Symmetry: C5
Subunit: 201 residues, 5 copies
């Protein structure tokens, strides 16, 4: 198979509205934020404006093809794929996607989608000008899929990606799995809590 045939097959059979659950087991979505920049911080309003790469991976076996004498990977517009309905629960702006809306699909049906996103959050900015710094917690999970349909799995150098020219510096980035239950709904929603420990230079 060549790229043209694989991309034709994916475009024609996609089902972007269909979560690719296998035998009633959840789709395992891995999420990791790579912080690139901290653009604006307000200790009064407890608001941060940040740029991060939202590394997102999951498996969709309906995309898979025989890799023998074929590419191992193709670039696919996300309009042709099911994508996790991830939201930042404490976002106060729409995610502004800075990059081409393409994901990498591996021949086994693994999808790697890593948009660069600029977004504003409501989080703890207190202590940003101290040596301990602020710890801003960003919570990311499925908006409509509970633990039986989507699970969020949090799994090196925090400053490998971070701009040397930022007014701020990153002390630590921790990612923990959590679960939130709401009075509307008997179901638990999995999220990743991203703790951004940072300070002014």
């Amino acid at each position: 198979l060549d790229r043209a045939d694989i991309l034709y097959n994916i475009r024609q059979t996609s089902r972007p509205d269909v979560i690719p659950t296998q035998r009633d087991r959840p789709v395992a979505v891995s999420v990791s934020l790579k912080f690139i920049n901290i653009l604006e911080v307000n200790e009064i309003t407890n608001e941060v404006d940040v740029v991060f790469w939202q590394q997102t991976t999951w498996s969709d076996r309906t995309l898979a093809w025989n890799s023998s004498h074929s590419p191992d990977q193709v670039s696919v517009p996300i309009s042709s794929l099911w994508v996790p309905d991830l939201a930042a629960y404490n976002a106060i702006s729409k995610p502004e996607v800075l990059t081409p809306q393409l994901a990498r699909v591996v021949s086994d049906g693994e999808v790697l989608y890593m948009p660069s996103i600029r977004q504003r959050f409501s989080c703890d900015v207190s202590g940003v000008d101290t040596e301990s710094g602020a710890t801003c917690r960003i919570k990311i999970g499925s908006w409509t899929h509970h633990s039986r349909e989507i699970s969020v799995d949090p799994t090196s150098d925090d400053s490998e990606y971070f701009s040397q020219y930022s007014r701020f510096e990153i002390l630590d980035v921790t990612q923990k799995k959590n679960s939130v239950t709401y009075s509307c709904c008997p179901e638990a929603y999995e999220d990743v809590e991203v703790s951004l420990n940072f300070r002014k230079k």
Copy 2:
């Protein structure tokens, strides 16, 4: 039935432009705002900038399927469903939807749509710096469907969802049914009046 079949059936037959009225009775829409944040307040201009979850529920029987050996619920893009044409009558900005535009559809045809919205309103900001606080009234109803086609009923801890990091705190949220009539339009439009009693901290 599996998810793929249910979502295929809904996409093919949903009729998103068709209000799902049963036997000439109005579609009962439940609306409840869960306030998440108050970002900006201006006592001079009487303007607030707020983030809320607009919990919206109604029944569309044309979406229903046999739940035996099937999912009880699916996630559906709102472009594939009829959705109430709700508007805030005192909004001064477009609703900025912060979340994926998906609704939950139950096998009985109940729809749950809860977007996170950031929006600016013209309302009473007077007394925001006092202990009694300001009471900002937000009116939400159908833009084009009158009382015979859509009824809007409020569903109802106010601060269960509210950000601990806001400069403001919520004293009380009351959500009451009302109606608006204008000279333009001979019909009554049902709304939910949401009274946000809040104040600056410290």
Copy 3:
């Protein structure tokens, strides 16, 4: 007929690009602005930022159905209808539509479209802080249809709709028919001239 059938018929035979002129009629468009709020005013730049409901009515007989044992009215997305190409001749921003883009269609083919619009205008802001107040004139007409294809007529109670919480108050709103001809364009374009007489409140 039920709602589903009427909306199917409109969606399937909807020619949204086709002005519904009849034999020896222009399409008669009624326009009336209901001011809801005045958000920002600049006496230096002569700019206002306003929210208004643009009450718009006209007839499209191709939408009509037999009302016997049928709804009298349906809600239709404007993407499925011809809509007048109205523009504010002195607008300095794109109209920001704040409301769902649905119109009401009556069984006789009358269309009622009333978007809530936020828009900025270049107009006379001088005297906004006085008792007489400023008079800001907004001109709205068809961008491309002249008097033989579209006529614009004003449809009236000014302050029924206006926010009590505005920094400003409305003294008077007058809406009068006018016509503009420019040297560019040999035809006359009908407009509604909306005179917004308003002032700042005391603090």
Copy 4:
């Protein structure tokens, strides 16, 4: 023929990607800016924010119909027509189109497209507060079509269109044909140079 038939024919057979060159001669595009407002001026940064009507005319014979017992003109969405790929070479913002995206097509295939555009430019703002005023030059031509495919031809005092309520006033507008050539690329690109001589009011 009625309007519905003409607009059907144009929608079905309009090749919007195909420049309507006749017998290997360039498409003659007429361009004239009618200034409506000057909203913001910065003498430090040499930037202006302006509103103008971009009067644009050209012929596309593939649109033509027999005018006998038919309309002489129809309104056509520009998505259904070939339109010149005009750009302002010294623009520092995207053209913000304030008007419905419709052109007028005459039965002989003449197209009149006149959008109202708000756009920011890098140009000479020096002397804006003097009696002689600033002269801001705006250059408009085809982005991708050279002189053999598109020619750009200008069609006084802009007092007829200019807002009496502007902080600024127009002293003179001159619109002259020019060409830009780069050393990289052997073809000339025709432009209209629009000299906006304006000043702040006393």
Copy 5:
């Protein structure tokens, strides 16, 4: 062939989602930024707001036609072509395209796409008020195609720059580089554009 036939053929057989690799060799994309304006500079935040023409060329043989008794070139909307998924790695705003989204296609299948882009970057603004000036580095490469699928090669400076800018350009150097991250085992080719400029 006339323009109508060429544009019909391109529109119909346009696979815009398909990188036009020939025998598993990378598509060679040439990139050169022509700076037109520097609008805003902040030495505190290390942010610049710039306007540039992103001269982009590559070959797509599926677009090619016999030039005998035909046009040598046509203008094609980029929605009808494969276009490189180029991104500025240090951009802090979406590229704002100021120009009509058309490319030039030559009869041999060479594509010339040169949008005017306004974009904000995080880069070294230190020394902007000195005689040596600031050196702001902008890195542009494929977002999803590694070195085996796309190569980026750089191609007179200040022929294009606005005389009315508060800033002036001392030098522009454009050099090939490669970036590898711990996340991702593949190397991504970029062009590093060093904009040496200062306040007047």
